[PDB]
């Protein structure tokens, strides 16, 4: 039940699945696009103590990932490295094919010790962590990411 | 039909993609001679034309919940076939049966 | 046309699945606030209606060999595209004139 929006005459309109419209023209598979947008373009605070508050640990759910085509220039990026008080790593290693965000100016790298109760870190709002053309659900160690959401369109 | 309701919406869009580049001249297409991992991207810039960008942000914010619910009920580790599936059902609706 | 030939056939089917739930209310769809791995299943029960279940068992028992023969001739590790290919051929069969 994924919604998609169509664009016509510089107007964005959310088409209904139930209603079929003859005005829609799809003549190839290059007109389907997926775009990732940032949260900091909506006025959300970006300072470091004001963003570490929305990431919480849990155990009992497995992660899932999706893919990207386009992007957006960013101004702030994060790169985490957290260890248990005894010295154990709190975050998993990155899998194969995962790379950091390509185009962003500032990078806030943070290293410290915290109370890692769970196994995977999730967003308390329902948004995505953004990597190099792959949108994940958890946080991978030592990789630069952004915060954002995903949309699908017909050009 | 989409009206923005965020406190702010930046009306400037500054994006990066990869495109296809069609054909090439020289020895560029050979992976032995070509670029590195960073260097394959093409930039651009668009301007707010009747509030397209803010409506786009609203659309993403509305999509997130259904996207998460769909991701919950699958077995794969990486998903690549959402758009092909959308094409297949679009073709099945009109031209079938 | 399928006639059961097994010594016995159980005429009651008690089944489980996952579904999608469409919409949810509350904080249910957030992976931080949602259920665990076990708890996403919806159950049911069905009775024999003109030998549906026994014929179903016969159909699976007949399909097994062709399924194995198809599986032998691929290089993948996991297969998810049998139904999509079935749809593609079902569409390709009729649209030629």
């Amino acid at each position, epitope marked *: 039940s994924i919604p998609l929006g169509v664009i016509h005459n510089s107007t964005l309109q959310v088409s209904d699945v139930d209603k079929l419209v003859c005005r829609d023209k799809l003549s190839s598979t290059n007109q389907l696009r997926s775009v990732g947008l940032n949260l900091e373009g909506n006025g959300v605070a970006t300072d470091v103590p004001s963003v570490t508050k929305r990431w919480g640990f849990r155990s009992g759910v497995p992660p899932k990932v999706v893919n990207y085509e386009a992007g957006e220039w960013a101004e702030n990026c994060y790169n985490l490295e957290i260890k248990k008080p005894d010295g154990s790593e709190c975050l998993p290693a990155a899998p194969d094919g995962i790379r950091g965000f390509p185009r962003c100016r500032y990078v806030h790298k943070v290293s410290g010790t915290g109370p890692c109760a769970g196994d995977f870190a999730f967003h308390k709002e329902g948004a995505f962590f953004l990597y190099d053309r792959l949108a994940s659900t958890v946080i991978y160690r030592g990789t630069t990411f952004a915060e954002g959401v995903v949309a699908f369109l017909i050009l | 039909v*989409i*009206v923005n*309701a965020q406190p702010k919406c930046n009306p400037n869009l500054h994006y990066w993609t990869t495109q296809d580049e069609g054909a090439a001249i020289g020895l560029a297409w050979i992976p032995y001679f070509g670029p590195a991992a960073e260097g394959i991207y093409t930039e651009g810039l668009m301007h707010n034309q009747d509030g397209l960008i803010c409506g786009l942000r609203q659309l993403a*914010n*509305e999509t997130t919940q*259904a996207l998460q619910l769909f991701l919950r009920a699958t077995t794969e580790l990486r998903t690549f076939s959402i758009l092909n599936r959308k094409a297949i059902d679009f073709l099945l609706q009109r031209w079938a049966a | 046309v399928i006639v059961n030939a097994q010594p016995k056939c159980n005429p009651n089917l008690h089944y489980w699945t996952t579904q999608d739930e469409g*919409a949810a*209310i*509350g*904080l249910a769809w957030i992976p931080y606030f949602g259920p665990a791995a076990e708890g996403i299943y919806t159950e049911g029960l069905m009775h024999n209606q003109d030998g549906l279940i026994c014929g179903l068992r016969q159909l699976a028992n007949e399909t097994t060999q062709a399924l194995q023969l198809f599986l032998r001739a691929t290089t993948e590790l996991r297969t998810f595209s049998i139904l999509n290919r079935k749809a593609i051929d079902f569409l390709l069969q009729r649209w030629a004139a």
Partner: antibody
Amino acid sequence: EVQLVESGGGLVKRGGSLRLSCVVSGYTFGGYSMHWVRQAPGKGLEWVSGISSSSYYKYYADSVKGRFTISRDNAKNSLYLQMNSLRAEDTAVYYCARDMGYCSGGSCPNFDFWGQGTTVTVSS
Amino acid sequence: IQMTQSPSSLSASVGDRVTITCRTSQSISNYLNWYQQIPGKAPKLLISTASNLHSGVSSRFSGSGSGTHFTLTISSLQPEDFATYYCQQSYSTPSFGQGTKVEIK
């Protein structure tokens, strides 16, 4: 100033049908989700149903599931409810309410604007 | 989820401080809201998220709590502060309270 006005309530016979409307004026209609609430002859409150901004998500209550229908229109800023197969327990006062959108589809309602409430009566 | 707010009726004189409690059968973090209703008028909003006052309301109202225990408090009665109160939660499907009435002596 935000103004919410309800209309359509009254008296109906047993097993009949009814329709209600809520009209909003004073701000942007299409950016927010709306909900219905109802109160009894003098007991507490109860929640009924709610809709989303793009008309993609709908919610219903167990006690009215399979009987009611909710809809909205952003063109004239209107909210509609249709109720069928009415019983004796549906004599009450109804309110249309607005909430702040802390959740993606309108699933975490924190009501902040109420109307004035109309009356529905059904008996012999 | 079911709620339990008590007492259901109180009577106090002008200049008193009134403290009410709302209780739940489940843990819902801090998704709680408070409401007030004059008899004959539609309800009006109060503090939200158990500690966040609305806009335009007096500073006499103050609420707090977490987990399963939440308390609302008013510091000075007024001739126009006799009404009905409610507590509501939104962690799961919404459910209201039963009501508590302030009276005069």
